[PDB]
């Protein structure tokens, strides 16, 4: 057909123009002087370009079509954008504790995956009653996330520069806090997930290990992770502010969950809560 030949000529012309534009961009030494003028911020090409991928995958998961890599990228976007970006923004050099806490946060959140895969077939959601899982208003969830961001940026702002913070025998307490946090959280998770038949359907009342010290141990362990984090860059003020905001939201969800399982269980969790009154921190609250 003649129109096919005409369109082939047009495609050849526009491809010639595009290839010529690309070639005269490349072999021009001045575009090489100006486009290699942006390599100084090759650290800042990645840390923001990945955020668009993270939010795009977040929207895709909100629709309901997310592979494992995209959800991993969602939590990675949150966690990296939390830990590494603010001190890199404030001092321009990242060396030391922010790296290892970026590792530690991912090592922390990949703990429901292993427990819910070992004693299970795969990561697919199962069928259960709708009333079992406690929900909480969306504005409060967004407020929790925003407060966590605010406290982390304020922690990086408040803390001294990464070379002024001491080492030696003062960095050994930080390791102690890290290890005790991950022990308590893993014990709490292993004790909670052992007694549930479905994904979250508790058959009985758990009162073992971290449950005989604190009624809500996973929550306390998570906050203690942020407390050790605010101790790492030496910013106690942010530690106190996350104490306030995390305590407020997390106590709200704890009250909702507790009233649900007191209604659904009765005297057992009643005498258990009589045994351990201290709800989040040992004999502080």
Ligand X SMILES: CCCCCCCCCCCC(=O)OC[C@H](COP(=O)([O-])O)OC(=O)CCCCCCCCCCC
CB of residue 94 vs ligand X: minimum separation in angstroms? 5
CA nearest to 195, candidates 256, 115, 274, 135: 115
Task: Pick what 99 binds: ligand X, another protein, none; C-beta below 5 to 8 Å, kind-dependent.
Answer: none
* Cα separation, 123 vs 137, whole angstroms: 26
| Residues near ligand X (CB under 6 A) | 43-44, 46-47, 84-85, 88, 92-94
* Cα separation, 98 vs 278, whole angstroms: 32
**Residues whose CB falls within 8 Å of the CB of residue 219, separated by 6 or more in sequence, listed in order:** 250, 253, 254, 280
CB of residue 164 vs another protein: minimum separation in angstroms? 13
CB of residue 102 vs ligand X: minimum separation in angstroms? 9
Task: Pick what 30 binds: another protein, ligand X, none; C-beta below 5 to 8 Å, kind-dependent.
Answer: another protein
Task: Pick what 33 binds: ligand X, another protein, none; C-beta below 5 to 8 Å, kind-dependent.
Answer: another protein
CB of residue 37 vs another protein: minimum separation in angstroms? 9
Closer Cβ to another protein, 90 or 93, answer by number: 93
**Residue 190 token pair:** 């292993």
**Residues whose CB falls within 8 Å of the CB of residue 261, separated by 6 or more in sequence, listed in order:** 202, 269
**Residue 118 token pair:** 């070992």
Could you say whether residue 42 binds another protein (CB under 8 A)? Answer: yes
CB of residue 161 vs ligand X: minimum separation in angstroms? 13
CB of residue 25 vs another protein: minimum separation in angstroms? 13
Task: Pick what 124 binds: another protein, ligand X, none; C-beta below 5 to 8 Å, kind-dependent.
Answer: none
* DSSP three-state, residue 202: strand
Size of the chain, expressed as the number of residues it contains:
285
Choosing from 15, 20, 43, 103, the residue that interacts with another protein (CB under 8 A) is 43
Closer Cβ to ligand X, 48 or 248, answer by number: 48
Could you say whether residue 93 binds another protein (CB under 8 A)? Answer: yes
How many chain residues touch another protein (CB under 8 A)? Answer: 13
Could you say whether residue 49 binds another protein (CB under 8 A)? Answer: no
Query: Which phi and psi angles does 202 have, rounded to 5°?
Result: -75, 125
Closer Cβ to another protein, 28 or 259, answer by number: 28
Closer Cβ to another protein, 159 or 217, answer by number: 159
User: Do the Cβ atoms of 104 and 98 come closer than 8 Å?
Assistant: no
Query: Which phi and psi angles does 196 have, rounded to 5°?
Result: -90, 125
DSSP per-residue letters across 122-171: -S------TTSSPP--HHHHHHHHHHHHHHHHHHHHHSPPTTTS--TTSS
Could you say whether residue 39 binds another protein (CB under 8 A)? Answer: yes
Closer Cβ to ligand X, 88 or 150, answer by number: 88
Choosing from 2, 5, 30, 169, the residue that interacts with another protein (CB under 8 A) is 30
Task: Pick what 44 binds: ligand X, another protein, none; C-beta below 5 to 8 Å, kind-dependent.
Answer: ligand X
Question: In DSSP terms, which residues pair with 202 in a beta bridge?
Answer: 196
**Residues whose CB falls within 8 Å of the CB of residue 82, separated by 6 or more in sequence, listed in order:** 105, 148, 149, 152
Q: Which residues bind another protein (CB under 8 A)?
A: 27, 29-30, 32-33, 36, 39-40, 42-43, 92-93, 95
């Amino acid at each position: 057909k003649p129109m096919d030949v005409v369109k082939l000529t047009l495609l050849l012309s526009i491809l010639t123009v595009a290839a010529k534009k690309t070639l005269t961009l490349v072999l021009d030494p001045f575009f090489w002087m100006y486009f290699s003028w942006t390599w100084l911020f090759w650290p800042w090409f990645i840390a923001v370009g990945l955020a668009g991928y993270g939010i795009y995958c977040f929207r895709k998961h909100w629709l309901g079509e997310a592979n494992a890599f995209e959800q991993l990228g969602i939590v990675t976007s949150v966690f990296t954008w939390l830990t590494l970006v603010p001190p890199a923004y404030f001092n321009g050099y990242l060396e030391g504790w922010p790296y290892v806490f970026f590792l530690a946060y991912h090592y922390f959140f990949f703990f429901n995956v292993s427990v819910r895969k070992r004693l299970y077939g795969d990561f697919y959601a199962r069928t259960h009653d709708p009333k079992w899982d406690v929900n909480t208003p969306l504005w409060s969830r967004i407020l929790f996330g925003v407060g966590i961001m605010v406290g982390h940026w304020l922690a990086a702002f408040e803390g001294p520069e990464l070379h002024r913070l001491p080492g030696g025998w003062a960095n050994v307490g930080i390791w102690i806090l890290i290890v005790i946090t991950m022990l308590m959280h893993y014990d709490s998770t292993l004790y909670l997930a052992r007694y549930s038949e479905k994904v979250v359907v508790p058959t009985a009342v758990v009162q073992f290990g971290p449950y005989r010290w604190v009624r809500h141990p996973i929550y306390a362990s998570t906050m203690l992770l942020f407390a050790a984090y605010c101790t790492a860059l030496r910013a106690p003020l942010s530690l106190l502010f996350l104490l306030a905001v995390c305590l407020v939201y997390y106590n709200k969800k704890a009250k909702m969950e507790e009233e649900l399982m007191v209604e659904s269980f009765g005297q057992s969790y009643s005498d258990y809560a009589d045994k351990v009154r201290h709800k989040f921190i040992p004999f502080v609250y």
